[PDB]
């Protein structure tokens, strides 16, 4: 009894994501694509890269 | 036996949310779109952005 198994697979991930925060004049916080409070009271940006 | 599945999807999200708190002297204050006044001087606002 002959039993035979064969497999192939090919995969690819590539690109970037972004989020961040600024503060202006102690009037306005702004946050982009964060669920955070923008707690720092100062400008932060955070890139994410994978390849 | 031939079993076939096909799937397509699209989504998009865009725009802004706003809330804040404003204080006039000690005696007066106003809360906009938020359960309570920020015990804070002057004014503060937040503009959550989704894109």
């Amino acid at each position: 009894l002959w039993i035979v198994d064969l497999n192939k697979s090919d995969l690819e991930r590539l690109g970037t994501s972004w989020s961040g925060s600024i503060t202006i004049g102690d009037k306005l916080g702004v946050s982009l694509n964060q669920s955070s409070i923008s707690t720092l009271d100062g400008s932060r940006f955070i890139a994410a890269v994978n390849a | 036996l031939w079993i076939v599945d096909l799937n397509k999807s699209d989504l998009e999200r865009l725009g802004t949310s706003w809330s804040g708190s404003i204080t006039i002297g000690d005696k007066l204050g106003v809360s906009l779109n938020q359960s309570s006044i920020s015990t804070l001087d002057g004014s503060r606002f937040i503009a959550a952005v989704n894109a």
Binding site: I37, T39 | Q34, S36, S38, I46
Partner: protein, 79 residues
């Protein structure tokens, strides 16, 4: 969202908002005194300010610690 705060940090903030400007005054006095260390007008002033700041911080920390102990004693009895 508003920066979330509890009870203990609000009792803490009560002191910071009780002393309107002491935090800055303490630096201003140091600045001018360091500018002319032998001036006795400046010295008695800085002595006053620093003696104030020291009691401010002590009373703050102790009050926070007592209000923690009162809560832990109740939360233990939930079992």
């Amino acid at each position: 969202a508003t920066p979330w705060s509890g009870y203990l940090d609000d009792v803490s903030a009560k002191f910071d908002t009780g002393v309107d400007n002491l935090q800055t005054q303490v630096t201003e006095a140091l600045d001018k005194l360091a500018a002319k260390p032998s001036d006795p007008a400046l010295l008695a002033a800085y002595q006053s300010k620093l003696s104030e700041y020291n009691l401010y911080r002590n009373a703050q920390s102790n009050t926070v610690k007592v209000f923690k102990d009162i809560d832990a004693a109740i939360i233990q009895n939930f079992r």
